[PDB]
Amino acid sequence: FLSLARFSDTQYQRIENYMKSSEFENKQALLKRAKERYTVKVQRELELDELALRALKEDRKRFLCKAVENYINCLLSGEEHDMWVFRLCSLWLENSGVSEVNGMMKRDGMKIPTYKFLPLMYQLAARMGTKMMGGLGFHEVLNNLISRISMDHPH
């Protein structure tokens, strides 16, 4: 599980770096300059680039979900690699808008022992909020996890 999580995280990080790379920005700026016969090809490129962006986003979402699931499974399957809870939390906080990640966290992270979340309790507590609470909302899941950790280790 740890090896699969590491590989999925590496692929997701590579995709994220490609999205934030200066090459992507230069290509987008070139397309914007080009869009300002000529019409047919302009709309053709403005459709092909959108299709490629959608496919890349779908691949990134799939890799992120697989990495989060494998990190959760690795955490639940042992204690030697408890330091990777930092990576799991970083992915969860940086991808709080994904409903699948929040649902996976709600379904499986509650089985994870709470003492693994103790070192990063400051960062877990600093993200508490109310504006986006709900059945699959990130805030409600985070509040429930924090409350369960507090109940297990109040000290």
Binding site: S22, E23, K27, L30, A34, L48
Partner: protein
């Protein structure tokens, strides 16, 4: 040789292969394929390039600041190449990419000459990368 310095990736149909290593190219190398002479020669060439990284970087710096060198991609060139029926920041980014290539950095990690050569061969011979390429490039050929 009008297209260079990875300006082909900026094209509407980006080039995902560092070079042409199609099935015909590998088949013409013999039964051994890329294994053997091709891989050892690629490793030796990469070692030579790495050992002369400073000279190559200096030469590319001389090229990139030439006022009459129109190496940057423009929409007219992009459409002409694929037709169907700040400059300083760009130059600095290109120089940084070249330096990373010369030092073996590909995805932020340090790779040896053999590892970099293996990665390039894998990327060139990957059917998935060839599928995305423009039909006029004739990836299947």
């Amino acid at each position: 040789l009008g297209v260079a310095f990875e300006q082909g990736k900026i094209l509407p149909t980006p080039e995902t292969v560092p070079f042409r290593l199609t099935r015909d190219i590998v088949d013409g190398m013999g039964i051994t394929g890329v294994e053997g002479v091709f891989r050892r020669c690629c490793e030796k060439t990469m070692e030579v390039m790495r050992n002369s990284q400073e000279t190559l970087l200096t030469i590319v710096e001389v090229l990139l600041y030439d006022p009459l060198f129109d190496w940057t991609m423009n929409p007219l060139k992009a459409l002409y190449l694929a037709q169907r029926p700040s400059f300083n920041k760009v130059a600095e980014r290109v120089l940084m990419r070249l330096q990373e290539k010369l030092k073996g950095v590909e995805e932020g990690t340090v790779l040896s000459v053999g590892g970099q050569v293996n990665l390039l061969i894998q990327q060139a011979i990957d059917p998935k990368n060839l599928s995305r390429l423009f039909p006029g490039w004739k990836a299947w050929v």
